[PDB]
Amino acid sequence: HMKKTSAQKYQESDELNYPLGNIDDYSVNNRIGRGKYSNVFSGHIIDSGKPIVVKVLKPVRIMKINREIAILNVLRNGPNISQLLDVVKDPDSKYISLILNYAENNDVKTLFGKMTTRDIALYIYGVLRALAFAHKNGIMHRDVKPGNIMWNQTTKEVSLIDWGLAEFYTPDSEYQVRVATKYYKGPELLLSYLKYTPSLDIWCLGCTLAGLLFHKLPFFKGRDSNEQIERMCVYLGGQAMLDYAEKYDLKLSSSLKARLSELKGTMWAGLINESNRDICTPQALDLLTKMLTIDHNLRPTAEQAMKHPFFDEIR
Numbered sequence: 001h002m003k004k005t006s007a008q009k010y011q012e013s014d015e016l017n018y019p020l021g022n023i024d025d026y027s028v029n030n031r032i033g034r035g036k037y038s039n040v041f042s043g044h045i046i047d048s049g050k051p052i053v054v055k056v057l058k059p060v061r062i063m064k065i066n067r068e069i070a071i072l073n074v075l076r077n078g079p080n081i082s083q084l085l086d087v088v089k090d091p092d093s094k095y096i097s098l099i100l101n102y103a104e105n106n107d108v109k110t111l112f113g114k115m116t117t118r119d120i121a122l123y124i125y126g127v128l129r130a131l132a133f134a135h136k137n138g139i140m141h142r143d144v145k146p147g148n149i150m151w152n153q154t155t156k157e158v159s160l161i162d163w164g165l166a167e168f169y170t171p172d173s174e175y176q177v178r179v180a181t182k183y184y185k186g187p188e189l190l191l192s193y194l195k196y197t198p199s200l201d202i203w204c205l206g207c208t209l210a211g212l213l214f215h216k217l218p219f220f221k222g223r224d225s226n227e228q229i230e231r232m233c234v235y236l237g238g239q240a241m242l243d244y245a246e247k248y249d250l251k252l253s254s255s256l257k258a259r260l261s262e263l264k265g266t267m268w269a270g271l272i273n274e275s276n277r278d279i280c281t282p283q284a285l286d287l288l289t290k291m292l293t294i295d296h297n298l299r300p301t302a303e304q305a306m307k308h309p310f311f312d313e314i315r
Contacts, residue, residue: 020088032053041054072098072163124208142179146217183218187203191252210288214272220232239265267289287305
C-alpha cells in the first residue's frame with residue numbers, strides 16, 4: 001500500500017512472540033540513547049518504583065524484533081545479561097517498547113588509571129561469564145564493546161546489553177559481516193569470511209581489554225578496512241594475517257599482501273608507561289595475546305578464557 005504515509009502504516013496492524021503487557025505499568029523519564037530504529041529511555045516500574053530501561057522501537061522489522069525477544073528469553077536465566085522484563089505496544093502510535101532491567105554505567109573511558117587489575121579482571125570475567133552462557137545456548141552477541149557493557153565501579157556489577165545484533169549460531173552457516181562496530185571488527189569480518197563463529201565475541205572483548213590496559217578506547221584505528229587490517233598487523237604481524245587469509249581462502253589485494261609482509265609485529269612494545277604499568281601484568285598481556293589471535297578457530301573459548309591464570313584471584 002504505497003499511497004500511505006509511514007505513520008498511517010503504523011496505525012494499521014505483525015505479531016510479536018510475547019504476551020504484551022500494559023504500557024501504563026511503566027513511566028519514562030530521560031532519553032539516554034538514540035539508535036537506528038530505537039530510542040532508549042530511563043524509567044521506572046510504577047507500582048514498585050524499580051528502575052528500568054525502556055527501548056522504544058518503530059514497528060518495523062518485526063522479524064528482527066522477534067529474534068531479539070527470542071534471544072533475550074533464552075538468556076533470561078543467564079548471568080550478567082540484560083533481563084527482558086516486559087514488552088508493550090503503544091495503543092495509539094503502535095510503537096513497541098522493550099522493558100529491560102537497569103544496570104548503572106560508569107563510562108570506562110573516564111576511569112583510566114582509576115580501574116585496578118582487580119577491576120579489569122572483574123569487568124572482563126563478568127562479560128566472559130555472559131558470553132559463555134550465551135555461547136553454550138547457541139547465541140553470539142556480535143557487538144561486544146564498551147558501549148554495550150554496563151560497569152558499576154563502586155559495586156563491580158557488570159552487564160552485557162544491546163542484543164539487537166545477536167544471532168543464533170549454527171556451524172557452517174553463512175552470516176552477514178556488517179556486524180560489530182568499527183575498530184571492534186575481527187579479521188573474519190574485515191576479510192569477509194562468512195562462516196564466522198561466536199569466537200568473534202572473544203576478539204571484540206579482547207579489543208576492549210586492550211583499550212583498558214593501554215588507556216586507549218577504541219584501541220585499533222584505521223580509516224578503511226585495508227588500513228584497519230594493516231593497523232592490526234603493526235602489532236600482531238603481517239605473516240599471521242597472510243597465513244590466515246591463505247588458510248581460509250580469503251582475498252587480499254595484491255597491494256595489501258605486499259604491505260603486510262613488511263610488518264613483523266611489535267606486540268605491546270611502546271604501549272606501557274608509568275600510568276598503565278601497574279595494570280599491564282604478564283598474565284593480563286598473556287590473556288590479551290590469546291584473545292587477539294587472528295585465526296578465529298585458535299582463540300580461546302569463553303570458558304577457556306575464564307580458566308586463564310589472570311582470573312585465579314577473583315575465582
